[PDB]
Amino acid sequence: TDQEIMDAHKIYFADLNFNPSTGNTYINGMYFAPTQTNKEALDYIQKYRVEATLQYSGFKDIGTKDKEMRNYLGDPNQPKTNYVNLRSYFTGGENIMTYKKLRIYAITPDDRELLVLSVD
């Protein structure tokens, strides 16, 4: 169901790169927590659609890509889980700005798009 998938994305960590000298913060991707109450709903979602604000271009649709399975938080000591690898999206060579508008959509294997993560 749409709410079961939606709640299965409420605990997430952003994979950021941060320059302390400069203050630039880019988002590389997004980890969704592998909790037992939402494991099956994360295994269900196979693709993610992203709209994000690029550093030089504006807010833009950057398309749809398969999820990656990645060790939670990059930790080899944690199990693999849903990872939205933002850097493989249609960004035109550009980095995605953190804290500016961002919309991530879970795509059912039936191709329906549901908003699971939203930042303004």
Side-chain angles (χ1 to χ4, degrees):
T1 55
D2 279 18
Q3 186 76 262
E4 213 155 87
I5 286 156
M6 222 154 284
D7 301 13
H9 286 78
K10 259 66 175 97
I11 295 125
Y12 63 97
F13 282 71
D15 186 12
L16 301 180
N17 297 145
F18 172 67
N19 192 326
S21 284
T22 280
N24 264 76
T25 325
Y26 309 131
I27 329 178
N28 307 291
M30 271 273 289
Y31 297 94
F32 291 104
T35 85
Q36 313 180 243
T37 179
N38 71 41
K39 225 272 173 205
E40 183 194 87
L42 281 179
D43 306 285
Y44 178 64
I45 309 298
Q46 208 72 359
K47 306 177 108 135
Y48 288 92
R49 201 271 264 274
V50 176
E51 298 155 347
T53 59
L54 300 186
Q55 177 161 32
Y56 297 97
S57 316
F59 183 73
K60 270 156 83 292
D61 180 11
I62 57 170
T64 302
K65 295 285 167 154
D66 282 25
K67 61 166 189 198
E68 299 188 341
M69 292 299 283
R70 273 202 184 179
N71 290 294
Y72 190 43
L73 304 180
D75 202 342
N77 304 334
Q78 299 188 135
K80 279 146 85 92
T81 194
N82 282 34
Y83 182 71
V84 175
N85 184 5
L86 297 176
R87 300 306 337 274
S88 57
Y89 281 76
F90 293 137
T91 72
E94 304 174 12
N95 291 295
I96 295 142
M97 287 315 226
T98 316
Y99 315 114
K100 272 88 211 161
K101 185 153 144 242
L102 165 85
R103 308 264 184 274
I104 288 160
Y105 298 90
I107 288 118
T108 56
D110 303 70
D111 315 315
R112 291 150 32 227
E113 288 189 8
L114 321 165
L115 194 278
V116 291
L117 189 270
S118 209
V119 178
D120 314 314

